[PDB]
Design a protein around this ligand. Structure first.
Ligand SMILES: O=C(NCc1ccc(F)cc1)[C@@H]1c2ccccc2C(=O)N1Cc1cc2ncccc2[nH]1
Ligand SMILES: O=C(NCc1ccc(F)cc1)[C@@H]1c2ccccc2C(=O)N1Cc1cc2ncccc2[nH]1
Ligand SMILES: CSC[C@H]1O[C@@H](n2cnc3c(N)ncnc32)[C@H](O)[C@@H]1O
Ligand SMILES: CSC[C@H]1O[C@@H](n2cnc3c(N)ncnc32)[C@H](O)[C@@H]1O
Lengths: 318, 303, 307, 318
């Protein structure tokens, strides 16, 4: 909706980082002697109401380099905003494209592709799948911003949050579906039982043959207290370009930024953990031609059931 | 040129007057502002460039339909519910508003000037048809005869009291204000456009939503042809003694037909909806079309 | 005292239009999301590939303004139940587009017309939209007391108006509503915007609408009489109806141009306010009960339970 | 499964009709003077365990014409059967392809494509979508067998069948989902209230620009008795080639054939019908990029709710 884009745009720290990332990439790709010979082809993949396009314009102006912008966006309601802006402000420098990036037949290859397809668990919005399908119209030496992102997990104990998830039981579905799906939540009344560890990582452009976005990760969390595990807090970090990053991981959290809240993967049944014991969690990223989803299971100190098998309770639509 | 800086994308109407000056109406049906404008082109080929116009003015709301009030006057069918009258000045450089009467309760979609030239009839989406006096600037009569939006109204060329009307209620009403019950219904698909025959007072043609162009005699038995693939927007006869009928549509094409509705010419020049057609009074073989693609195409019709 | 809105089908500048409407005392504005005349193609080339923006920007108002002050309107050219297959398919795509843009803006309500008997495909498209995504937006079905065909002037020579008392036939607009909401399976998001005509129907035709979810009452400017002072008023027939409607606590919408040109447009609303103040005040029952209207509660069981 | 293909193959009337259809098409496409010059390229689209391939071989032998067979099949379990058969019996004349027909890049265009993708309601197995996506590798003058198929509907009164559907209520789903989905059923204890009428028709190859498989059909059924409508029996007819047809419509039923049972579209609530009244039903065929489904509603003599809106209760997977 409009007011969903509105609140995203209300985070100036994020777009200043995007501005700085693009600014740096333009200087690296275009030398001083080729300032006015070389026009860089930028493509905002998922332009929304156009915060990045604006940042791309600001970036080029502070760098003093020439750019040609495409603004690809599938949401036709947002494309209305883009085109009104484009007519009034931007002009012919920005070519608004109303299409899916995985479908769009590009009339030109890009030097840079810029995207904002990251959620609270990084790849929970299918950023890998989208940028893989947009990869073909990147130049062989082309750059992606972001170039990398990683998701993190940490075991938590919250009898409040467990009791909250429990209450999300609905008519006409599995009685325990609510435990087999992640939630975006500002975690407050909780206890982080161990330090976050990296779960899944993705690099763009992807150069590994048979680009497989399926994953399986085993994490061992040393717990130094007695407690009751109720779920797993999820965070993420992303490398926009080089040293320009965004992060919601508590220990490396970008200061001021409030666009992404933490994600929560619950478990059906609470699990006792003694001091000295290791919590061992297993996370899968799964997919077919239609859906992507996560499955997860605790294997130590006791086994849980595998949560969300075949995405029965939760899928992410392709 | 003592006029607005930029005209609107969607060209709605184009009319030639006696000498051969091209009148243009246009609306912005997209973007921030949804207004309309009126333009004059003593040079028809210069259209639709705003830097080379005789006259031009910005109206309060969009222009749904217009037609020439002889030489000076221009009568407008506005979205506001007003029927606006504008008059060219003596120099014919400015366009001052004569009158603008908010009487319709919805968009005024069609307008036509009657034989006398002091009267006109308007049709609106409020399902009404009103008779105007252009002198006293008042509504003479108001008629709710249809049961749905009035699409097209067309005054009889040579009879002041007579006019046609068609609506989405699937009715073609032939009127005569001399009768107590003025309307008379002529006996599938909704009618969208009307055109009286210029040389025959009893003959008229109508285009429908399905693209069929029909030939109707008042007394009687009808003839028709599937000219367009989509709705017929307008029908305009040529100034010839033996007239050719120009048909425009939402299929983005123009077709010129003979008396038996056989296809003579075809033009897929426009990329958007073809909104109007006007035959050049100087050169009878020339026909000017305007569309929402912002083109003003001049067609050489083989005659 | 009374909650009122303004219906317009012509908005040249959305910011300016609201200001005028607000200055006249109206609480909200019923208006289009796309230009009523901006007909769009979705199948056939080249018109389907029409460039440029399809409508105004959402940025022209604040999120809050969209959420509280604007009521959407379906475009008049959109006819989902057309006999022509092309127009049907186009109107389907257009209806979804307009509804989706309504949701995007976060409009509290959106008007759709019931101006004919068969609105099956209209219902099918709306029901599909309701069961897609999440929204709390209401849908107000614009339905007349008296069908347009039944209040036309008897001025067609070879087509006289029905001068016969047709008990069932005069209730036809309720059957349009009834069928529509039955098809849509009594969605709580679908309600009635009852359009009041110049000539009110028989009493039974009005009683028909008792117990129906009437959220709005559309009042054309044409139905207003003029008093000795030269200001808009209503008949005693319409007065009793408004008094009944005020009990239901509906929102009154004014539509149409200013036929009382010499006066302001606030005068129409001032008259509704005048009626609102001039009603029988709530008794001890209605004062206390105010709040519990149609609120379901479990019957008390003082034996089984301790109160 | 294997035993699902087994029971299909146990219908000799069906494949004899396919044999005869192909036999006739070969004679029409290849004259007597071009008997041994012209080798026709046949492509069985959805070969299963290869009943059609065999029929295509029999057809060519009784016609005495040369053919080159492709056997396209997506089910990899069936492809095991095909390849074992192909090695042992058929040989290099049959090229077994293990692929989706909508995906497969053909190395040659076909003169004939043969398919068996029809269900009880004709298009309920998405035969339109599959053959549309296989259309590109048909010659400009190429033939499809079947070339056409039509679905039929008829109102029925069965308090037994209504009561049967009712009992299909399951945990963890809509309480009335069972009424918003079709069933294959040998109709026995029922009353057909009116004569079947055609619902949806499909032609292959499809030559209408913007090939739209969505549909909306209004049917009016004159009822000459008092009764209680409980649902709509569905049947189908198909034109394989010219006068060679298959049909399960009771009045034109192919004698002996027992491959397809009738389909049943129920309604939530029974509807009273007086003698002289017309039952008016509305049927939609709907789709998105992922699913196809039917919606339906009764509009006379009283209105029902629209059944299966947005395919909430029943979808057919693309
Ligand atoms: O975490 C979130 N925002 C935190 C927040 C902060 C303040 C506030 F008043 C309300 C919410 C959003 C969000 C909000 C509501 C419901 C769900 C979510 C969600 O998945 N988010 C993550 C997110 C932000 C974002 N921006 C661009 C592109 C992809 C994006 N993905
Ligand atoms: O109607 C059906 N068969 C009737 C039947 C006859 C005898 C018997 F002992 C059992 C069942 C099958 C069927 C069976 C069981 C469950 C469902 C179905 C069903 O949708 N059918 C239709 C069907 C047959 C078929 N063949 C090839 C390709 C597509 C096809 N689609
Ligand atoms: C700013 S939030 C992400 C934005 O990217 C857009 N988006 C997501 N996936 C795609 C895609 N495949 N093609 C184009 N835009 C996309 C979404 O509609 C949203 O506006
Ligand atoms: C004989 S039943 C229909 C057969 O066609 C196959 N089939 C259905 N759709 C396709 C498709 N798109 N590509 C290939 N085979 C298909 C099925 O797997 C089955 O064996």
């Amino acid at each position: 909706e409009s007011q969903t884009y509105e609140v995203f745009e209300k985070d100036p720290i994020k777009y200043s980082q995007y501005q700085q990332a693009i600014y740096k990439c333009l200087l690296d790709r275009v030398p001083e002697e080729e300032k006015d010979t070389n026009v860089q082809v930028l493509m905002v993949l998922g332009a929304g109401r156009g915060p990045l396009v604006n940042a791309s314009l600001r970036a080029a102006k502070q760098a003093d380099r020439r750019i040609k912008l495409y603004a690809v966006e599938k949401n036709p309601n947002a494309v209305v905003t883009l085109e009104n802006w484009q007519f009034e402000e931007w002009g012919s420098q920005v070519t608004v494209v109303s299409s899916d990036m995985r479908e769009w037949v590009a009339p030109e290859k890009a030097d840079i592709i810029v995207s904002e397809l990251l959620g609270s668990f990084a790849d929970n919005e299918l950023s890998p799948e989208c940028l893989d399908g947009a990869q073909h119209f990147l130049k062989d030496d082309g750059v992606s911003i972001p170039g990398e992102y990683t998701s993190f997990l940490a075991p938590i104990s919250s009898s409040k949050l467990y009791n909250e998830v429990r209450a999300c039981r609905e008519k006409d579905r599995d009685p325990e579906a609510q435990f087999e799906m992640p939630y975006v939540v500002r975690l407050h009344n909780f206890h982080q039982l161990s330090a976050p560890q990296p779960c899944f990582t993705f690099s763009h452009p992807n150069r590994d043959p048979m680009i497989d976005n399926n994953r399986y990760c085993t994490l061992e969390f040393p717990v130094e207290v007695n407690t009751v595990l109720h779920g797993f807090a999820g965070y993420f970090e992303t490398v926009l370009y080089q040293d320009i990053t965004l992060s919601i991981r508590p220990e490396t959290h970008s200061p001021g930024m409030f666009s992404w809240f933490p994600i929560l993967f619950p478990i059906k049944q609470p699990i006792t953990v003694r001091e000295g014991q290791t919590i061992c969690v297993r996370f899968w990223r799964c997919s077919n031609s239609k859906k992507v989803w996560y499955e997860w299971a605790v294997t130590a100190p006791v086994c849980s059931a595998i949560h969300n098998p075949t995405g029965r309770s939760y899928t992410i639509g392709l | 040129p003592n006029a607005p800086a930029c005209m609107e994308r969607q060209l709605e109407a184009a009319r030639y007057r006696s000498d051969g000056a091209l009148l243009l109406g246009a609306s912005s049906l997209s973007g921030r502002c949804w207004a309309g404008s009126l333009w004059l082109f003593k040079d028809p080929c210069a259209a639709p460039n705003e830097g080379f116009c005789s006259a031009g003015v910005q109206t309060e709301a969009g222009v749904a339909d217009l037609t020439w009030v002889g030489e000076r006057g221009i009568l407008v069918a506005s979205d506001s519910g007003a029927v606006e009258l504008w008059e060219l000045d003596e120099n014919e450089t400015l366009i001052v508003s004569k009158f603008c009467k908010y009487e319709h309760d919805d968009i005024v979609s069609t307008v036509s000037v009657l034989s006398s030239g002091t009267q006109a009839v308007s049709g609106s989406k409020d399902i009404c048809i009103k008779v105007w006096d252009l002198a006293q600037q008042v509504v003479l009569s108001s008629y709710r005869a249809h049961a749905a939006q009035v699409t097209c109204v067309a005054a009889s060329p040579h009879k002041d009291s007579v006019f046609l009307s068609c609506s989405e209620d699937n009715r073609i009403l032939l009127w005569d204000t001399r009768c107590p019950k003025p309307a008379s219904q002529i006996g599938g698909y909704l009618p969208t456009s009307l055109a009286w025959h210029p040389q025959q007072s009893e003959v008229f043609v109508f285009g429908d939503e399905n693209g069929t162009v029909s030939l109707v005699d008042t007394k009687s038995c009808v003839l028709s042809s599937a000219v367009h693939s989509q709705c017929v927007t307008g029908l305009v006869f040529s100034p010839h003694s033996v007239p050719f009928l120009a048909s425009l549509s939402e299929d983005c094409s123009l077709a010129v037909l003979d008396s038996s509705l056989s296809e003579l010419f075809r033009s897929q020049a426009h990329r958007d909806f073809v909104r109007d057609a006007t035959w050049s009074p100087l050169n009878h073989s020339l026909l000017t079309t305007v569309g929402w693609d912002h083109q003003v195409v001049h067609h050489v019709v083989p005659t | 005292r009374v909650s009122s809105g303004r219906d317009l089908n012509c908005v040249p500048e959305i910011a300016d239009t609201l200001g005028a409407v607000a200055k006249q005392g109206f609480d909200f504005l019923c208006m289009p999301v796309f230009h009523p005349r901006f007909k769009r193609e979705f199948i056939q080339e080249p018109a389907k590939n029409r460039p440029g923006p399809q409508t105004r920007s959402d940025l022209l108002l604040s999120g809050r303004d969209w959420n509280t002050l604007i009521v959407g309107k379906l475009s008049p050219w959109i006819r989902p139940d057309s006999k022509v297959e092309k127009i049907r398919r186009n109107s389907e795509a257009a209806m979804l587009q307009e509804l989706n843009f309504g949701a995007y803006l976060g409009l509290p309500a959106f008007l759709l017309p019931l101006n004919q008997e068969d609105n099956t495909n209209l219902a099918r498209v709306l029901t599909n939209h309701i069961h897609t995504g999440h929204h709390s937006s209401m849908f107000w079905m614009r339905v007349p007391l008296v069908a347009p065909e039944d209040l036309r002037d008897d001025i067609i020579e070879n087509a006289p108006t029905t001068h016969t008392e047709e008990y069932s036939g005069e209730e036809k607009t309720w059957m349009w509503w009834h069928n529509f909401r039955t098809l849509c399976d009594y969605s709580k998001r679908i309600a009635v915007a009852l359009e009041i005509g110049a000539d009110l129907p028989s009493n039974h035709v009005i009683d028909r609408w008792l117990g129906e979810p009437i959220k709005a009452a559309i009042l054309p400017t044409s139905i207003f009489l003029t008093n000795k002072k030269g200001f808009p008023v209503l008949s005693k027939m319409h007065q009793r109806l408004i008094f009944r409607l005020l009990k239901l606590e509906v929102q009154f919408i004014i539509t149409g141009t200013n036929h009382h040109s010499e006066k302001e447009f606030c005068s129409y609303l001032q008259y509704l306010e005048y009626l609102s103040q001039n009603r029988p005040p709530p008794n001890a029952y209605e004062l206390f009960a105010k709040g519990y209207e149609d609120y379901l509660q479990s019957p008390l069981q003082p034996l089984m339970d301790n109160l």
